[PDB]
Structure 1
Amino acid sequence: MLTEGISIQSYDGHTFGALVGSPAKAPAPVIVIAHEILGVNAFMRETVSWLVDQGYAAVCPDLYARQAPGTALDPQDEAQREQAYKLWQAFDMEAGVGDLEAAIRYARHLPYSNGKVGLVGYSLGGALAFLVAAKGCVDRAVGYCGVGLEKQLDKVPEVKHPALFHMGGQDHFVPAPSRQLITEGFGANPLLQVHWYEGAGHSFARTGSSDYVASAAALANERTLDFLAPLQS
């Protein structure tokens, strides 16, 4: 689902839509939400609603629009999960970073913006959140359950603003050596935080997922909100 009429244009003239939640009161910091591999779906609607309830505005851009505008896949359905994996496999990560940077510039200038912008990413978006943190166009970045962080360690010293990451201890995408590499590498830069959630799998914060773990999701989400709160006026 996207908000009708919202259009953000990127570095290369590509345009894309977004689901937008205006804040309960103006002004407010704006959070750009980077979605999972399933597009702007029910979990994104939930996440927009949650952040608005917590005193933010929210913008969730259609990152798959370079491939298939308006993707919104239900992870309960095998056919739709297969489409998600096919889209992820083809996903251009550098163009994703560019599109998020465009969405962050757009968010900064919204009429109710207090001039501060955060980024919260999940899954595909959790990996993009690190890349965006390395580029420095956001005030604070959060990534849940990103894949492949252990291959981006050269970017650790490039991070110049705070970024927070939440990672499952039983995430098959992040086996023990990868966890050690991330823990040691990210540890070198005190602007980064990475928290591991023992007993929690890859999609531990996605409501409805068989991976969901209420206690771990609760702690990760509490940490996210405390980390974003300094952006509020």
Structure 2
Amino acid sequence: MLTEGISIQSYDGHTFGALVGSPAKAPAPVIVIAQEIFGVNAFMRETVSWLVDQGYAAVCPDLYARQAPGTALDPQDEAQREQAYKLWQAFDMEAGVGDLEAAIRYARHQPYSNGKVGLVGYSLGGALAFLVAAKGYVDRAVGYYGVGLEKQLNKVPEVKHPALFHMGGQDHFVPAPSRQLITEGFGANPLLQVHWYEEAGHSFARTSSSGYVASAAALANERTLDFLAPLQ
């Protein structure tokens, strides 16, 4: 779902919608949520309400709007899950970071915003969170099981704002060597932080997933809440 009337525009002219969640009391820091490859779907809504109850405002931009606006896919549905793979395969990460940048500007200026903006990303969004972090567009970013992180190691020296990552130990998407590259690369920057949940795989934090692990999810989400706390 997307909020009716919300329209964010990128430097190149493209405009896209977003599922917005206003805070209970204002002003409050805004958390821009970067999606997985399934668009603004059920988990994205779940995530929106999770953060508003924790005391934040939430903005989940429709990043697939350049390819297919309003797309919201079900990972458990074979057909839909495949559309996701197709859209992900055509996804342009540069524009993704640009739209994210625009959504970040949107958030800092809302009547309820306190000027603080954090960014949380899952899967595809986990890679984007790292990149926005390397660009320095946010106060602090968090990534959940980011894919292709090992391919972005050269940007490690560029991140000058705190960033936290949660990676599952038995994540198929992350081969053992990738783990070594990631851990070794992130470790040097005192502002990056990567935790590995040994008994967890991919999407361990999304309940609909079979990879969901309650203890891993609980710890990960707790660390996320304490890392974001300074923004309030």
Show the counterpart of 2:29.
29
Shift of 1:23: 0.2
Shift of 1:123: 0.7
Q: What secondary structure is seen at the aligned counterpart in 2 of 1:184?
A: helix
In the aligned structure 2, how far is the partner of 1:216 from the partner of 1:70? 31
Q: What secondary structure is seen at the aligned counterpart in 2 of 1:152?
A: helix
Which runs of 5 or more structure 1 residues have no equivalent in the other structure? none
Matched, 1:14 2:14: yes
How many residue pairs get matched? 232
In the aligned structure 2, how far is the partner of 1:90 from the partner of 1:11? 21
Shift of 1:56: 0.1
TM-score using structure 2 length: 0.99
In the aligned structure 2, how far is the partner of 1:37 from the partner of 1:211? 16
Shift of 1:226: 0.3
Shift of 1:104: 0.3
1:145-170 deviation per Cα after TM superposition (whole angstroms, max 9, x unaligned): 11111110100010010000000100
Show the counterpart of 1:160.
160
1:72-102 deviation per Cα after TM superposition (whole angstroms, max 9, x unaligned): 0111211110010100010000000000000
Shift of 1:30: 0.1
Shift of 1:135: 0.1
Show the counterpart of 2:194.
194
Which runs of 5 or more structure 2 residues have no equivalent in the other structure? none
Q: What secondary structure is seen at the aligned counterpart in 2 of 1:224?
A: helix
State the identity as a percent: 96
For residues 96-135 of structure 1, the aligned pairs below 5 Å read 96-135=96-135
In the aligned structure 2, how far is the partner of 1:113 from the partner of 1:103? 13
In the aligned structure 2, how far is the partner of 1:203 from the partner of 1:18? 22
Shift of 1:175: 1.2
In the aligned structure 2, how far is the partner of 1:19 from the partner of 1:160? 29
In the aligned structure 2, how far is the partner of 1:22 from the partner of 1:88? 29
Please list every run of at least 4 consecutive aligned residues from structure 1 whose deviation after the TM superposition is greater than 6 angstroms.
Answer: none
1:160-216 deviation per Cα after TM superposition (whole angstroms, max 9, x unaligned): 100000001001111111101100110010100000000111110011100100000
Matched, 1:173 2:165: no
In the aligned structure 2, how far is the partner of 1:135 from the partner of 1:31? 17
TM-score using structure 1 length: 0.99
